Amino acid sequence: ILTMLVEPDAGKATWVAASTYGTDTTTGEEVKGALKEIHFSTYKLAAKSFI
Amino acid sequence: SSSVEVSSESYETIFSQRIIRDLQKELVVGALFEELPMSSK
């Protein structure tokens, strides 16, 4: 197998308000993502001939 | 609210002095023609 990592999709960054400004919420929502994987493997083709 | 620790009462807002017109009506008729510089009624 050959597994590669596919980067995860975009997640929005929150629009904080004015009350939030000056508080821990000012920093806004966390944007969090997990890499995903795609896997490649092999099959077989074979043939025989016989003189 | 611009209210963290210390405050200013709207002194800050940049009152600005730039003016503008909404692509206002083109005038096309008034000037097209020519004038007969008349002297009376």
Swiss-Prot record, chain A:
It comes from the Viruses. Transmembrane segments: none annotated. It is found in: Virion. Changing M4T: Confers resistance to Pycsar-mediated defense. Signal peptide: none annotated. Interacts with the decoration protein; each hexon binds a single copy of the decoration protein. Interacts with the portal protein. Major capsid protein that self-associates to form 120 hexamers and 11 pentamers, building the T=13 icosahedral capsid which about 860 Angstroms in diameter. Responsible for its self-assembly into a procapsid. The phage does not need to encode a separate scaffolfing protein because its capsid protein contains the delta domain that carries that function. The capsid gains its final stability through the reorganization of the subunits that takes place upon expansion. DNA encapsidation through the portal triggers capsid expansion and the binding of the decoration protein to the capsid exterior. This is Major capsid protein. It comes from Escherichia phage T5. The chain holds residues 205 to 255 of 458 of the full protein.
UniProtKB/Swiss-Prot annotation, chain B:
Changing I20T: Confers resistance to Pycsar-mediated defense. It is found in: Virion. It comes from the Viruses. Interacts with the decoration protein; each hexon binds a single copy of the decoration protein. Interacts with the portal protein. Major capsid protein that self-associates to form 120 hexamers and 11 pentamers, building the T=13 icosahedral capsid which about 860 Angstroms in diameter. Responsible for its self-assembly into a procapsid. The phage does not need to encode a separate scaffolfing protein because its capsid protein contains the delta domain that carries that function. The capsid gains its final stability through the reorganization of the subunits that takes place upon expansion. DNA encapsidation through the portal triggers capsid expansion and the binding of the decoration protein to the capsid exterior. This is Major capsid protein. The lineage of its organism: Viruses, Duplodnaviria, Heunggongvirae, Uroviricota, Caudoviricetes. The gene is D20. The chain holds residues 164 to 204 of 458 of the full protein.
